[PDB]
């Protein structure tokens, strides 16, 4: 396996960030890849047995580090807006070109010029329509997560206190609420569809949950509104007999 | 030095045959290794298949790709795509004379669309559980060929088509959501910029 | 009836901190990698026009060998290598004719570790004009061999020697050559 | 100077029998002159030659894709490097330079490649099998060979047969 941290990170231009990665395959070679906004995949570094072997004209802003064969860390000394990307850790048996690369889940970095643009989502659940229930004997709930920035969110549905996956569809990408602005806040929708008899039971509880990844307790906040920290925002509905 | 593959999003009905083109520029690297990597939704990048010998073909998960020397291509084919094949597919190469350095193509987003057996297209209005004044419009149960057009009004929001699967019922359905704060916004005209089935149900509330 | 052996031979030696990387074909060197200049050095110049090799891969292997040597030294509880003095032979490339260009060959064989001092002596005095030497070549017994060359015009009044210094030798070894 | 030495050696060997039809790959690691671990393509895995390589053999054989990689080395490494240099190594032919001259108490064959050679003394028109003193094959280290084949005993002909020539080479004296 290939493990890397953090999963998400927001920071301001000029700050320092540190990524860490580990692989348990027993491999000698590890890599850092950059996946930009256009989703083009480009190699940055290759390390073989704690020694850098490939450097694809990476700005000196980036300082990789490896004191062990299974570990490869990355430090960006003073982030610039173009550093906003997904950084992928990878490993291979050795530096032979025939080898398969095994990738991690990625570190999603968002570098912003002003942290006052960071907003948590507002979440609302919309109850099924009486018309759908009468017409199809099914009941669709809709969850709207709106006004969040950056788009570092994870949405889940919870029925009677348990996360469900069946009958769920979430938008693969968020909408920009103001497509003209590059710093536009986002919106996301999801649906949960159940049978009408399940929704019409008042003993049933439905909750839409949006995990938001924002600032940490370490960051400073001078604004009057609440510090947009990593948090969960939820909206709920109980079943309606009538 | 360069890898070129099919650009953007490809939509294919389930059980149809698929080809994703990929060509490489045989410039400075005289003998490359060729790879296909796949990223399933919500997962990380992983190898689909690879061919390290010129001429041979590799296969995995019903996919197949031939390292074509003369054509300088590595096209990915599958005779009958399945809905689980929906993913992003990356074509890649590495120079076989030096350190491993994967050169990736732009990536191809594959969306395998299931066939809706009994469509029942309708547009419903849903009200917020918290504030009865807020509402959204739900277009659902339409056939698979219907295309949901994104909004060209900045104050109207329309999501893309979403496929949900109620597994205990063995029931799949398409849906899209539209909402707005404009006073003249109504579900009757929310999807007017789309060509939807003529028999779409518009319940009168 | 084509029976051949291709060997990629590498070594690293402490505490001298010297390593080398070479390809062997049937006892002949195809190329080696100059660690200092990070360059592929073909034994014959014409080889470079027909094939290539990225020398950076050799530097990566030598680095692994250096790190592996420190580990293997620990596994053996710091057991050092045992010196093996070399056999030294001096010969000529072609039959000797007076005033006809020729080259002396000093062949050093069956020795370890791969560290030697070699000096050509013309009439007992050092000569360094136009000399060439090879890298340490591997042997099947995992010792080393080496070739030194000295071009010369044979004369009756000139006498040559090949002085070889090795840690396995109690005194410098000196092999002699002269014209009949 | 007086301080002890420590040597690590690695040898990746490709053995070819009748071209690339039958190939054996050997990945060999050495401490001093002792082989402590080895991958043999006939075996299919790493094996400790001595107790010194027991950790490496166990560790390497467990690595992801290691056994698959090393079992493919006969194709991706041996057969490939064989073809890269075939035109100037396997197919290299340099014909011998033969001089026959007597000495006071000799067929000198110089500058030929490859090393396989066959030389005989004829005196005269019938080969002489007695009194032949052969120095043996001598490698010059510059992709050429040489050898001295002496005879002490009329037309003298030294016959040299070498893979660079289609017919025997004869030098009379």
């Amino acid at each position: 396996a290939v493990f890397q941290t953090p999963n998400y990170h927001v920071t301001q231009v000029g700050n320092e960030v540190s990524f860490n990665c580990k692989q348990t395959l027993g491999h000698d070679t590890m890599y850092w890849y950059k996946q930009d906004s256009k989703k083009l995949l480009k190699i940055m570094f290759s390390y073989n047995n704690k020694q850098l072997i490939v450097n694809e004209t990476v700005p000196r802003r980036f300082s990789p580090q490896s004191s062990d064969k299974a570990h490869l860390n990355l430090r960006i000394k003073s982030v610039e807006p173009e550093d906003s990307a997904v950084y992928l850790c990878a490993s291979s048996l050795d530096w032979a070109s025939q080898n398969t690369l095994y990738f991690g889940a990625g570190t999603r970095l968002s570098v912003l010029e002003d942290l006052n643009k960071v907003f948590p989502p507002e979440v609302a659940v919309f109850e099924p329509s009486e018309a759908e229930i009468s017409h199809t004997q099914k009941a669709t709930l809709v969850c709207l997560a709106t006004g969040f920035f950056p788009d570092h969110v994870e949405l889940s549905w919870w029925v009677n206190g348990k996360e469900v996956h069946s009958g769920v569809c979430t938008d693969p990408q968020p909408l920009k609420e103001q497509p003209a602005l590059n710093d536009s806040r986002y919106a996301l929708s999801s649906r949960l569809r159940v049978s009408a008899t399940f929704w019409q039971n008042p003993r049933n509880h439905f909750r839409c949950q949006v995990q938001f990844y924002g600032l940490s307790e370490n960051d400073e906040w001078t604004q009057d509104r609440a510090k947009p920290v990593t948090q969960i925002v939820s909206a709920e509905a109980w079943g309606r007999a009538d | 030095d360069s890898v070129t593959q099919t650009e953007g999003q490809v939509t294919v009905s389930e059980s149809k045959s698929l080809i994703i083109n990929c060509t490489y520029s045989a410039t400075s690297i005289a003998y490359p290794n060729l790879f296909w990597y796949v990223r399933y939704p919500g997962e990380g990048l992983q190898l689909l298949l690879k061919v390290i010998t010129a001429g041979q073909k590799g296969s995995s998960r019903g996919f197949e790709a031939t390292y074509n020397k003369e054509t300088t291509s590595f096209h990915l084919q599958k005779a009958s795509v399945q809905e689980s094949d929906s993913a992003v597919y990356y074509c890649a190469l590495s120079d076989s004379s030096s350190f491993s350095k994967l050169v990736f193509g732009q990536g191809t987003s594959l969306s395998v669309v299931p066939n809706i057996q009994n469509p029942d297209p309708a547009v419903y209005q849903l009200r917020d559980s918290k504030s009865s004044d807020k509402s959204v419009c739900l277009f659902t149960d339409f056939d698979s060929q219907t295309n949901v057009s994104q909004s060209k009004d900045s104050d109207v929001y329309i999501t893309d088509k979403c496929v949900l699967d109620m597994r205990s019922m063995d029931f799949k359905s398409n849906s899209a959501v539209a909402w707005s704060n404009k006073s003249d916004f109504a579900c009757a005209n929310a999807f007017n910029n789309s060509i939807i089935p003529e028999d779409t149900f518009f319940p009168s509330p | 009836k084509e029976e051949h052996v291709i060997i990629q031979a590498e070594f690293y030696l402490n505490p001298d901190q010297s390593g080398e990387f070479m390809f062997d074909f049937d006892g002949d060197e195809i190329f080696h990698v100059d660690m200092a200049k990070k360059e592929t050095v073909w034994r014959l110049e014409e080889f470079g026009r027909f094939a290539s090799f990225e020398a950076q891969g050799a530097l990566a292997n030598i680095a692994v060998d250096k790190a592996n040597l420190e580990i293997m030294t620990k596994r053996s509880n710091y057991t050092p290598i045992t010196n093996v003095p070399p056999e030294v032979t001096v010969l000529t490339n072609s039959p000797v004719e007076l005033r006809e260009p020729n080259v002396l060959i000093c062949f050093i064989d069956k020795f370890t570790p791969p560290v030697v001092n070699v000096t050509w002596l013309r009439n007992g005095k050092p000569v360094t004009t136009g000399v060439s030497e090879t890298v340490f070549l591997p042997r099947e017994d995992h010792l080393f061999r080496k070739f030194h060359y000295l071009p010369f015009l044979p004369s009756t009044e000139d006498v040559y020697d090949c002085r070889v210094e090795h840690w396995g030798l109690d005194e410098p070894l000196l092999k002699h050559w002269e014209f009949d | 100077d007086t301080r002890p030495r420590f040597l690590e050696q690695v040898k990746h060997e490709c053995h070819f029998f009748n071209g690339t039809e039958r190939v054996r790959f050997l990945d060999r690691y050495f401490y001093h002159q002792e082989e402590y671990v080895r991958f043999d393509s006939d075996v299919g895995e790493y094996r400790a030659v001595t107790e010194l390589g027991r950790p490496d053999a166990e560790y390497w054989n467990s690595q992801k894709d290691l056994l698959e990689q090393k079992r493919a080395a006969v194709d991706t490494y041996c057969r490939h490097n064989y073809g890269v240099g075939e035109s100037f190594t396997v197919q290299r032919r340099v014909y011998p330079e033969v001089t026959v001259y007597p000495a006071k108490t000799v067929c000198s064959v110089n500058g030929f490649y490859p090393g396989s050679i066959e030389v005989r003394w004829f005196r005269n028109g019938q080969e002489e099998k007695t009194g032949v003193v052969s120095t043996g094959l001598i490698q010059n280290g510059d992709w050429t060979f040489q050898t001295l084949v002496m005879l002490e005993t009329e037309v003298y002909t030294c016959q040299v047969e070498h893979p660079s020539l289609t017919s025997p080479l004869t030098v009379e004296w």
């Binding site: 047995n49 064969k69 | 076989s96 | 990629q8 990566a60 592996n68 | 690695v10 390497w60 490097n81 890269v84």
Partner: peptide, 13 residues
Amino acid sequence: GGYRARPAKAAAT
């Protein structure tokens, strides 16, 4: 053509 180096493996610690 290009010669292919066989990569040296890091020893177990």
